[PDB]
C-alpha cells in the first residue's frame, strides 16, 4: 500500500433518544471476564 498521515478519530458518534418521559431498561445481560496485570517486585541487586 503506502504510508499516510491524518487526524485521529476520538470515537464514533452516538445520539441518545432523550425525552422527558422515555426510559430504556435491559431485558438480558452477559457475564464478561477481563484481566489486569500489575508489577509487584523488581530484582535485588
Amino acid at each position: 500500500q503506502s504510508i499516510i498521515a491524518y487526524t485521529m478519530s476520538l470515537g464514533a458518534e452516538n445520539s441518545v433518544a432523550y425525552s422527558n418521559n422515555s426510559i430504556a431498561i435491559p431485558t438480558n445481560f452477559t457475564i464478561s471476564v477481563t484481566t489486569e496485570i500489575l508489577p509487584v517486585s523488581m530484582t535485588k541487586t
Binding site: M8, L10, G11, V16
Partner: peptide, 28 residues
C-alpha cells in the same frame, strides 16, 4: 527556544480534550 533546548507539542490538542469533556457531560 534556547541553546539546544526544545519543547515538544502534546499529542492531543485542546480541542480534542474539549470533545472528551463534552461527551462525558452529554452522557451523564
Amino acid at each position: 527556544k534556547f541553546k539546544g533546548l526544545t519543547v515538544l507539542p502534546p499529542l492531543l490538542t485542546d480541542e480534542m480534550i474539549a470533545q472528551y469533556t463534552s461527551a462525558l457531560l452529554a452522557g451523564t
